[PDB]
Design a protein around this motif. Structure first.
Motif, PDB file in Angstrom:
ATOM      1  N   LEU A   4       0.936  -1.157  -0.094  1.00 24.35           N
ATOM      2  CA  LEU A   4       0.162   0.242   0.274  1.00 24.35           C
ATOM      3  C   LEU A   4       0.790   1.117   0.023  1.00 24.35           C
ATOM      4  O   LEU A   4       0.469   1.773  -0.649  1.00 24.35           O
ATOM      5  CB  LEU A   4      -1.155   0.103   1.207  1.00 24.35           C
ATOM      6  N   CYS A   5       1.587   1.127   0.586  1.00 27.83           N
ATOM      7  CA  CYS A   5       2.461   2.374   0.813  1.00 27.83           C
ATOM      8  C   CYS A   5       4.038   2.173  -0.554  1.00 27.83           C
ATOM      9  O   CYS A   5       4.088   3.587  -1.259  1.00 27.83           O
ATOM     10  CB  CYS A   5       4.295   2.310   2.190  1.00 27.83           C
ATOM     11  N   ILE A   6       3.369   1.221  -1.256  1.00 31.79           N
ATOM     12  CA  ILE A   6       3.996   1.470  -3.428  1.00 31.79           C
ATOM     13  C   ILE A   6       3.057   2.138  -3.707  1.00 31.79           C
ATOM     14  O   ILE A   6       2.839   3.479  -4.699  1.00 31.79           O
ATOM     15  CB  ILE A   6       4.075   0.109  -3.550  1.00 31.79           C
ATOM     16  N   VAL A   7       1.458   2.010  -3.233  1.00 30.36           N
ATOM     17  CA  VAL A   7       0.407   2.603  -4.138  1.00 30.36           C
ATOM     18  C   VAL A   7       0.072   3.953  -3.428  1.00 30.36           C
ATOM     19  O   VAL A   7       0.231   4.491  -4.872  1.00 30.36           O
ATOM     20  CB  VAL A   7      -1.337   2.089  -3.172  1.00 30.36           C
ATOM     21  N   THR A   8       0.507   4.453  -2.924  1.00 32.99           N
ATOM     22  CA  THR A   8       1.262   5.750  -2.194  1.00 32.99           C
ATOM     23  C   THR A   8       2.313   6.239  -2.382  1.00 32.99           C
ATOM     24  O   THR A   8       1.827   7.363  -2.753  1.00 32.99           O
ATOM     25  CB  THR A   8       1.024   6.236  -0.478  1.00 32.99           C
ATOM     26  N   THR A   9       3.037   5.439  -2.578  1.00 37.56           N
ATOM     27  CA  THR A   9       3.983   6.447  -3.332  1.00 37.56           C
ATOM     28  C   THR A   9       4.047   7.145  -4.804  1.00 37.56           C
ATOM     29  O   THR A   9       4.858   7.559  -5.636  1.00 37.56           O
ATOM     30  CB  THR A   9       5.216   5.570  -3.557  1.00 37.56           C
ATOM     31  N   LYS A  10       3.276   5.944  -5.219  1.00 42.09           N
ATOM     32  CA  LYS A  10       2.933   5.958  -6.631  1.00 42.09           C
ATOM     33  C   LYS A  10       2.092   7.041  -7.146  1.00 42.09           C
ATOM     34  O   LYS A  10       2.156   8.113  -8.123  1.00 42.09           O
ATOM     35  CB  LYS A  10       2.092   4.522  -7.484  1.00 42.09           C
ATOM     36  N   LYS A  11       0.728   7.693  -5.803  1.00 38.03           N
ATOM     37  CA  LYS A  11       0.456   8.848  -5.865  1.00 38.03           C
ATOM     38  C   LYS A  11       1.163   9.986  -5.725  1.00 38.03           C
ATOM     39  O   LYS A  11       0.849  10.988  -6.517  1.00 38.03           O
ATOM     40  CB  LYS A  11      -0.858   8.193  -5.028  1.00 38.03           C
ATOM     41  N   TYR A  12       2.516   9.905  -4.827  1.00 40.65           N
ATOM     42  CA  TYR A  12       2.851  11.326  -4.125  1.00 40.65           C
ATOM     43  C   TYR A  12       3.765  11.538  -5.490  1.00 40.65           C
ATOM     44  O   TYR A  12       4.045  12.309  -5.883  1.00 40.65           O
ATOM     45  CB  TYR A  12       3.785  10.858  -3.205  1.00 40.65           C
ATOM     46  N   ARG A  13       4.007  10.414  -6.240  1.00 39.40           N
ATOM     47  CA  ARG A  13       5.330  10.249  -7.502  1.00 39.40           C
ATOM     48  C   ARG A  13       3.928  10.341  -9.240  1.00 39.40           C
ATOM     49  O   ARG A  13       4.561  10.596 -10.132  1.00 39.40           O
ATOM     50  CB  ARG A  13       6.212   8.995  -7.704  1.00 39.40           C
ATOM     51  N   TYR A  14       2.921  10.626  -8.610  1.00 38.70           N
ATOM     52  CA  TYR A  14       1.804  10.782  -9.696  1.00 38.70           C
ATOM     53  C   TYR A  14       1.231  12.234  -9.740  1.00 38.70           C
ATOM     54  O   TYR A  14       0.776  12.767 -10.554  1.00 38.70           O
ATOM     55  CB  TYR A  14       1.196   9.803  -9.921  1.00 38.70           C
ATOM     56  N   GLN A  15       1.618  12.674  -8.157  1.00 40.17           N
ATOM     57  CA  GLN A  15       0.947  14.101  -8.114  1.00 40.17           C
ATOM     58  C   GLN A  15       1.861  15.254  -8.997  1.00 40.17           C
ATOM     59  O   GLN A  15       1.315  16.491  -9.101  1.00 40.17           O
ATOM     60  CB  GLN A  15       0.854  14.277  -6.626  1.00 40.17           C
ATOM     61  N   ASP A  16       3.271  14.925  -8.758  1.00 39.60           N
ATOM     62  CA  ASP A  16       4.382  15.508  -9.182  1.00 39.60           C
ATOM     63  C   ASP A  16       4.290  16.009 -10.897  1.00 39.60           C
ATOM     64  O   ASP A  16       4.217  17.076 -11.226  1.00 39.60           O
ATOM     65  CB  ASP A  16       5.542  14.649  -9.064  1.00 39.60           C
TER      66      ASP A  16
ATOM     67  N   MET B  68      -7.632  -2.396  -1.113  1.00 43.55           N
ATOM     68  CA  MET B  68      -6.182  -1.786  -0.355  1.00 43.55           C
ATOM     69  C   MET B  68      -6.108  -0.258  -1.345  1.00 43.55           C
ATOM     70  O   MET B  68      -5.700   0.763  -0.967  1.00 43.55           O
ATOM     71  CB  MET B  68      -5.527  -2.851  -0.307  1.00 43.55           C
ATOM     72  N   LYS B  72      -6.069   3.369  -1.870  1.00 46.92           N
ATOM     73  CA  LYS B  72      -4.865   5.092  -1.650  1.00 46.92           C
ATOM     74  C   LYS B  72      -5.245   5.421  -3.134  1.00 46.92           C
ATOM     75  O   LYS B  72      -4.597   6.784  -2.867  1.00 46.92           O
ATOM     76  CB  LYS B  72      -3.868   3.690  -1.399  1.00 46.92           C
ATOM     77  N   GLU B  84       1.876   5.418   7.410  1.00 44.12           N
ATOM     78  CA  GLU B  84       2.317   4.489   6.063  1.00 44.12           C
ATOM     79  C   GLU B  84       3.667   5.087   4.968  1.00 44.12           C
ATOM     80  O   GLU B  84       4.498   4.738   5.368  1.00 44.12           O
ATOM     81  CB  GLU B  84       0.756   4.034   5.609  1.00 44.12           C
ATOM     82  N   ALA B  85       3.108   5.335   4.420  1.00 42.79           N
ATOM     83  CA  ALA B  85       4.156   6.205   3.000  1.00 42.79           C
ATOM     84  C   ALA B  85       5.330   7.106   3.922  1.00 42.79           C
ATOM     85  O   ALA B  85       6.268   7.626   3.644  1.00 42.79           O
ATOM     86  CB  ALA B  85       3.624   6.651   2.375  1.00 42.79           C
ATOM     87  N   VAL B  88       7.693   4.799   5.624  1.00 42.21           N
ATOM     88  CA  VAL B  88       8.363   4.753   4.639  1.00 42.21           C
ATOM     89  C   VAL B  88       9.295   5.147   3.996  1.00 42.21           C
ATOM     90  O   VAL B  88      10.325   5.383   3.272  1.00 42.21           O
ATOM     91  CB  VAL B  88       7.298   3.584   3.297  1.00 42.21           C
ATOM     92  N   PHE B  89       8.862   6.367   3.743  1.00 39.55           N
ATOM     93  CA  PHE B  89       9.668   7.469   3.466  1.00 39.55           C
ATOM     94  C   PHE B  89      10.627   7.915   3.890  1.00 39.55           C
ATOM     95  O   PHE B  89      12.122   8.307   3.602  1.00 39.55           O
ATOM     96  CB  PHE B  89       9.315   9.036   2.638  1.00 39.55           C
ATOM     97  N   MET B 121      11.277  15.755  -7.949  1.00 35.37           N
ATOM     98  CA  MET B 121      10.120  15.386  -6.932  1.00 35.37           C
ATOM     99  C   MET B 121       9.949  15.550  -6.406  1.00 35.37           C
ATOM    100  O   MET B 121       9.097  17.010  -5.756  1.00 35.37           O
ATOM    101  CB  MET B 121       9.636  14.182  -7.372  1.00 35.37           C
ATOM    102  N   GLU B 124       8.155  19.091  -5.548  1.00 33.72           N
ATOM    103  CA  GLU B 124       6.344  18.883  -5.430  1.00 33.72           C
ATOM    104  C   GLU B 124       5.398  19.602  -4.459  1.00 33.72           C
ATOM    105  O   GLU B 124       4.421  19.780  -3.980  1.00 33.72           O
ATOM    106  CB  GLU B 124       5.879  17.659  -6.352  1.00 33.72           C
ATOM    107  N   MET B 141      -0.557  17.723   0.467  1.00 34.23           N
ATOM    108  CA  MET B 141       0.112  16.607  -1.035  1.00 34.23           C
ATOM    109  C   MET B 141      -1.112  15.755  -1.574  1.00 34.23           C
ATOM    110  O   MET B 141      -1.195  15.562  -2.381  1.00 34.23           O
ATOM    111  CB  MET B 141       1.080  16.435  -1.087  1.00 34.23           C
ATOM    112  N   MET B 142      -1.556  15.243  -0.441  1.00 32.71           N
ATOM    113  CA  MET B 142      -2.439  13.915  -0.315  1.00 32.71           C
ATOM    114  C   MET B 142      -3.573  13.845  -0.194  1.00 32.71           C
ATOM    115  O   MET B 142      -3.826  13.522  -1.350  1.00 32.71           O
ATOM    116  CB  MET B 142      -1.018  12.570   0.506  1.00 32.71           C
TER     117      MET B 142
END
Ligand SMILES: [Ca+2]
Ligand SMILES: [Ca+2]
Ligand SMILES: [Ca+2]
Ligand SMILES: [Ca+2]
Lengths: 19, 144
Positions: A4-16, B68, B72, B84-85, B88-89, B121, B124, B141-142
């Motif tokens: 899911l953090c990957i999905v969040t990372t993709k969202k965050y990286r898609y927001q750019d 899931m 997100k 969560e994110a 991870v970051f 990035m 952003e 941002m999120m």
């Protein structure tokens, strides 16, 4: 959490991709 | 859901899986969560999984993966999601992300981002331009 953090990372990286 | 996104998620699924079975296990993800600079035990390893697990088996399967992901992909009511994110970051656990920790995670996952892409990035969510992304900047941002 993990996958899911990957999905969040993709969202965050898609927001750019905007401006 | 956009086909472009589907093709992107295809890449993610390809990195989490390391057996060619097509299902996310604890042993596979545990290995990545290890390369993040951490070492979790059986209790922690299942704790992470339980977050995604809704059936009660202790494994990230497809049904839970869809829900899931939807949680997100269109997350704009970020409650625990922010953390969560953020966890991870933010590897240092200071509450401020930068091209420091972000570079590590981007390379750990295996995404197509260079060192210069990481800094770009990073700006952003970086409003003040301090080189870091704080909780406030991440929320706006999120969630926004
Ligand atoms: Ca697998
Ligand atoms: Ca499950
Ligand atoms: Ca940090
Ligand atoms: Ca900032």
């Amino acid at each position: 959490m993990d996958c899911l953090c990957i999905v969040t990372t993709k969202k965050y990286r898609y927001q750019d991709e905007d401006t | 859901l956009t086909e472009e996104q589907i093709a992107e998620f295809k890449e993610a699924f390809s990195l989490f899986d390391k057996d060619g079975d097509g299902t996310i296990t604890t042993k596979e993800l545990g290995t990545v969560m290890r390369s993040l600079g951490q070492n979790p035990t059986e209790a922690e390893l299942q704790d992470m999984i339980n977050e995604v697990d809704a059936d009660g088996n202790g494994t990230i399967d497809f049904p839970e993966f869809l829900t899931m992901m939807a949680r997100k992909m269109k997350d704009t009511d970020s409650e625990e999601e922010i953390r969560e994110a953020f966890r991870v970051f933010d590897k240092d656990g200071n509450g401020y992300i930068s091209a420091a920790e972000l570079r590590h995670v981007m390379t750990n996952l295996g995404e197509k981002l260079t060192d210069e892409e990481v800094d770009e990035m990073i700006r952003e969510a970086d409003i003040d331009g301090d080189g870091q992304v704080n909780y406030e900047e991440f929320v706006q941002m999120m969630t926004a």
